[PDB]
């Protein structure tokens, strides 16, 4: 909504085309949008995600060209891709590790938002849509991981469909529908394939809206101070056109990211993975060392922190006449952790946008970040003492942050003064 100059048809073809389908003008306004001068290296995860989505989609289509979604051939079919398909081994490892890169990026993308208040008015829709992508992403990655049909694939498939068979009443129905049978079997693999293919396109469409969302409000900068919109004159004092300034840092940033990424795929392709998925799915035994995918660990930690012996669970069990047992409580905790995060635009009562100028906020924020790391770390630890306590304190801190701390800091906290203008911040 900043003050600028729109596309002006100059060429001959350009004037012909423009009067019929102003598609060139649209592309123009999308990459000629005035962007704040002070953006830092935390604003480059959006485009790393773009890349990731595109990378996954094309490598996916390619991979789907050699993959057979049927329990008798799926695992064999992926080895075929590793051993026979020209550059298959590389295409596989790229789709795989591509997933990890996709998540490393969202978390950074997300936490960037949490710290700078990019989710605060008028950016709530950008934020909500974002959350939808996140769920879609997770669902997608989940189904994809099942396709190889290795051990981690099968049991992961079992445990996740199982989550729905924990919903009181309708539960076993929903679960039998997801499985198309009494167990995880071909019918399950076959429909996951179809959905794994379909979801990325939904994410893509959502991303379109996501983009549209922030172009409508303008991007938030590290100072939380809006761009001046009283005259192109001062508006330009706070901004610089997206092209070529940000298009270039993006490509630069992408090259550095891809450098590390390719180093990973080239030299340590199986680090971020689980050795057990190189073992064909066995429906009669679950690997003693089964473990969710690292990007799923934090939420998996929250889920199994809640066993029968936990008080809050017991209170709930008793208070609901036994409906909310440990099983269902863990499930509600996990999705609740995500849902709570989606509600932050409303749980956060401080009127100050950037956490840069919030003294108390900062401590809780970093505790949150540390907590996220800790949760991911416990996810891989056993359930014995003291991991059970650590996972518990951690889960507790998570909800405490969105439900209690942020709402309270809204009043308690006495914030520092932010720059008067982006221009002023950029110069200083």
């Amino acid at each position: 909504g900043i003050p600028h100059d729109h596309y002006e048809p100059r060429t001959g073809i350009e004037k012909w085309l423009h009067s019929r389908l102003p598609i060139v003008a649209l592309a123009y306004d999308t990459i000629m949008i005035p962007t704040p001068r002070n953006l830092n290296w935390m604003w480059i995860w959006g485009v790393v995600l773009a890349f990731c989505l595109v990378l996954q989609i094309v490598t996916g289509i390619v991979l789907a060209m050699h993959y057979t979604p049927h329990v008798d051939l799926a695992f064999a079919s992926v080895e075929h891709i590793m051993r026979n398909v020209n550059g298959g081994f590389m295409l596989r490892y790229l789709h795989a590790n591509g997933a990890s890169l996709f998540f490393i990026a969202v978390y950074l993308h997300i936490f960037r938002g949490l710290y700078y208040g990019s989710y605060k008015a008028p950016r709530e829709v950008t934020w909500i849509v974002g959350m939808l992508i996140y769920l879609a992403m997770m669902a997608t990655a989940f189904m994809g991981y099942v396709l190889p049909w290795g051990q981690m694939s099968f049991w992961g498939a079992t445990v996740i469909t199982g989550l729905f068979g924990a919903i009181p009443g309708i539960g076993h129905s929903i679960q039998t529908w997801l499985l198309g049978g009494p167990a995880v079997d071909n019918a399950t693999l076959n429909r996951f394939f179809s959905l794994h293919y379909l979801l990325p396109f939904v994410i893509a469409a959502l991303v379109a809206i996501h983009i549209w969302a922030f172009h409508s409000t303008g991007n938030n900068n590290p100072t939380g101070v809006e761009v001046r919109r009283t005259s192109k004159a001062e508006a330009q004092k706070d901004t610089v056109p997206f092209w070529p300034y940000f298009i270039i840092k993006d490509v630069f940033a992408l090259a550095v990211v891809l450098l590390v990424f390719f180093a990973i795929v080239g030299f340590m392709p199986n680090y971020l993975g689980h050795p057990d998925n190189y073992i064909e799915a066995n429906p009669l035994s679950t690997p003693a060392h089964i473990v969710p995918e690292w990007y799923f660990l934090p939420f998996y930690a929250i889920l199994r922190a809640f066993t029968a012996d936990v008080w809050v669970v017991q209170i709930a069990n008793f208070i609901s006449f036994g409906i909310i047992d440990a099983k269902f409580f863990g499930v509600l905790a996990m999705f609740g952790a995500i849902l709570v995060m989606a509600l932050v635009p409303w749980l956060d009562t401080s009127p100050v946008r950037s956490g840069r100028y919030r003294p108390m906020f900062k401590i809780y924020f970093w505790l949150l970040a540390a907590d996220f790391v800790i949760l991911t770390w416990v996810g891989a630890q056993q359930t014995t003492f003291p991991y059970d306590w650590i996972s518990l304190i951690a889960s507790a801190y998570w909800f405490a942050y969105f439900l209690v701390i942020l709402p309270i800091l809204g009043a308690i906290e006495k914030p520092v003064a932010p720059p008067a203008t982006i221009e002023e911040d950029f110069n200083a």
């Binding site: 081994f89 270039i248 891809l258 450098l259 199986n270």
Partner: protein
């Protein structure tokens, strides 16, 4: 169970520059053929890959001769015939002998430290070392705590972390005393059990170390391809990064 500790072998293929040792893989293929193959199979390994670059790289006619010793049930003839290089090695003959096609990747040997996995970020997954250690780890004498409680049919192995352990070998809390456990695989390597061509030594250590590298290749035949692809990519990018870095610095200087 848990993830234990394995003997750290300095295989040729480790490191961003490591590559297979053609003759080693050749020796390994022989160990596998005359020893393991009796119980283990490699169903995802097409025999004809014994010829492809980056591996044992045997001459096509040898490979063709090799596939001979296998009886395969045709896929149309319904009958049996001699193995063609287009055939995959057979399935494990011994029902409970796992498939070795991907074994070197199916195992990790560098677990930890503290679940942080920082140990692999430097040590890799240790699949080959793991396999090595299992062939190594067959002590002549059963660890003390098991003295008279050895599950018949099994054998104590120092590297194995997923076998049963006599109750008389666990501690107050149920954990095991032993470093290893009981595996259903009887010791497979006896000294000079394989008659190498070039005379090379067939000490249990050597054979074990060779067959391991073979299996590492059998699981990652495109290892070298991957690393070359990797090195190439890192290069474009290092260069491209620098240019873009300068292009960006130049472009932005007109602002700051």
């Amino acid at each position: 169970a848990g993830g234990g500790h394995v003997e750290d072998v300095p295989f040729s293929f480790e490191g961003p520059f490591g590559t297979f040792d053609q003759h080693q893989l050749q020796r390994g293929l022989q160990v596998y053929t005359e020893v393991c193959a009796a119980c283990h199979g490699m169903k995802f390994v097409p025999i004809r890959s014994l010829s492809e670059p980056g591996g044992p790289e045997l001459p096509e006619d040898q490979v063709r001769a090799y596939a001979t010793q296998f009886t395969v049930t045709d896929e149309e003839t319904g009958e049996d015939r001699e193995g063609k290089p287009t055939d995959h090695f057979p399935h494990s003959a011994l029902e409970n002998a796992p498939d070795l096609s991907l074994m070197a990747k199916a195992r990790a040997g560098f677990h930890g430290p503290m679940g942080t996995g920082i140990s692999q970020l430097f040590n890799g997954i240790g699949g080959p070392e793991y396999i090595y250690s299992v062939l190594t780890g067959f002590p002549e004498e059963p660890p003390k705590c098991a003295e008279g409680h050895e599950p018949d049919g099994f054998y104590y192995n120092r590297a194995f972390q997923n076998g049963s352990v006599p109750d008389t070998c666990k501690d107050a809390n149920g954990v095991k005393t032993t470093a290893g456990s009981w595996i259903a695989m009887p010791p497979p390597l006896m000294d000079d059990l394989v008659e190498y061509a070039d005379g090379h030594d067939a000490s249990v250590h050597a054979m074990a170390e060779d067959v391991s590298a073979f299996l590492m290749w059998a699981a990652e035949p495109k290892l070298m391809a991957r690393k070359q692809a990797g090195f190439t990519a890192v290069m474009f990018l290092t260069v491209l990064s620098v240019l873009l870095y300068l292009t960006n610095k130049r472009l932005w200087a007109g602002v700051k």
